[PDB]
Design a protein around this ligand. Structure first.
Ligand code: HEM
Ligand SMILES: COc1ccc(C(=O)O)cc1
Length: 393
């Protein structure tokens, strides 16, 4: 009943061009079996959306990577929120939703917008820049570590740790093992900055510690919650912004539209999050024998969700290979869906929007003048290098 496919969704051949293999996964059926790693796969929007919204059947406490925590020791102490299920997940989730609240976005927006404007001015002075290192990477590193109250020393560990977290969700390929080996320095730095005395007052980290008084979390849970904001929220926004810049380059007509109405910047970034989907895959583990789309999945089985393919499903999207800044992107699963939907989606959209706002008002054209290099990760899709030339507006 269930087709078995030999496609390796975590291979370098897959990462370089996943879209043909993704149609093959969608068209093979609503549930595929992937012999390479002995997991179930779902690639259509309908089934990816259904598993994300059935947390009781498709749990997260047994890991959201390939590894089954009930079977193997996790490479690090499990996340208090991403790798938890209700009710254990509920009160840590409420804390992060209040720390990263709409009320919190008002205190940082003008600081995040001003730094996005100054960065674009800075790169327009240099003309030919690397949109990844000098823009996609440079900007969020100039606002987010400060917004969390991180000290200046050691910030070079942040990106290496971020890419390690997402490589570790993957299978035991050499991408994951090279990242886990010699990961001790980044782990040591991140763990120490989780302690309250190292978090500047007013930042995200100190705010999370301030929530121990409420009875929502205890003091010993606070550092691990801080760890989530140092593991997630950097590498996804970098790839997300680098994709938007890449899209504006390959679709110059969309850049001219954003230039004519810069209030499209927030949706221009949202459509870029659907179009590229920086987080490409996440896992769930079955707690039951479940009937999924006419296909029976047993207990304790890993189910791989293809979020990027679900965002390009022609059964759900009109012309999904097209970048449309005016597309009604509502319902995409780049940020997830349900009880685990990104808790930091407001920070990402804010970072993305103010950058695309700055570009819309200062740049006339964005032209690629150099070899584009892909960045390879077990979980993230994004560019390694995007040589661009910016023409001032
Ligand atoms: C382009 C930007 C981003 C993308 C594409 C993205 C993607 C995702 C996705 C798909 C999930 C769901 C995981 C699951 O259901 O298993 C998630 C959860 C999460 N994200 Fe994001 N994210 C982004 C930005 C951020 C930011 C800015 C932060 C923090 C400041 C953040 C922190 C988190 C956390 C803590 C969770 C776990 C929430 C939970 O388990 O309830 N992410 N993210
Ligand atoms: C979606 O990416 C992540 C990665 C790590 C965590 C976490 O540390 O809880 C959450 C989300």
């Amino acid at each position: 009943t269930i087709p078995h496919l030999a496609i390796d969704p975590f291979s370098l051949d897959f990462f370089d061009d996943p879209y043909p293999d993704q149609q093959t996964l969608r068209d093979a059926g609503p549930v595929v079996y992937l012999d390479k790693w002995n997991v179930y796969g779902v690639a259509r929007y309908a089934e990816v959306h259904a598993v994300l919204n059935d947390p009781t059947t498709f749990c997260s406490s047994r890991g959201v990577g390939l590894s089954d925590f009930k079977k193997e020791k996790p490479w690090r102490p499990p996340s208090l929120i991403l790798e938890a299920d209700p009710p254990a997940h509920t009160r840590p989730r409420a804390v992060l939703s209040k720390v990263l609240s709409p009320a919190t976005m008002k205190t940082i927006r003008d600081g995040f917008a001003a730094a996005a404007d100054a960065k674009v001015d800075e790169l327009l002075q240099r003309g030919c820049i690397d949109a990844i290192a000098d823009l996609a990477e440079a900007y969020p590193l100039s606002v987010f570590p400060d917004a969390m109250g991180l000290k200046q020393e050691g910030r070079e560990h942040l990106l290496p740790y971020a890419g390690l977290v997402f490589n570790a969700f993957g299978p035991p390929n050499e991408l994951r093992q090279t990242a886990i080996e010699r990961s001790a320095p980044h782990q040591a730095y991140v763990n120490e900055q989780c302690q309250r005395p190292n978090l500047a007052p007013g930042g995200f980290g100190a705010c999370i510690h301030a929530f121990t008084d409420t009875g929502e979390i205890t003091p010993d849970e606070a550092p691990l919650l801080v760890r989530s904001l140092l593991s997630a929220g950097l590498d996804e926004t970098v790839n997300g912004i680098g994709a938007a810049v890449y899209c504006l380059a390959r679709f110059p007509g969309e850049l001219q539209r954003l230039r004519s109405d810069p209030t499209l910047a927030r949706n221009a970034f949202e459509e870029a999050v659907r179009f590229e989907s920086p987080v490409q895959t996440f896992f769930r583990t079955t707690t039951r024998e479940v009937e999924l789309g006419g296909a029976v999945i047993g207990e304790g089985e890993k189910v791989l969700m293809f979020l990027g393919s679900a965002n390009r499903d022609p059964r759900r999207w009109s012309d999904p290979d097209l970048y449309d800044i005016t597309r009604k992107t509502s319902g995409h699963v780049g940020f997830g869906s349900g009880v685990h939907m990104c808790v930091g989606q407001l920070v990402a959209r804010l970072e993305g929007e103010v950058m695309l706002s700055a570009l819309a008002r200062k740049v006339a054209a964005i032209d690629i003048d150099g070899p584009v290099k892909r960045r390879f990760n077990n979980t993230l899709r994004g560019l390694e290098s995007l040589p661009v030339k910016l023409t001032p507006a």
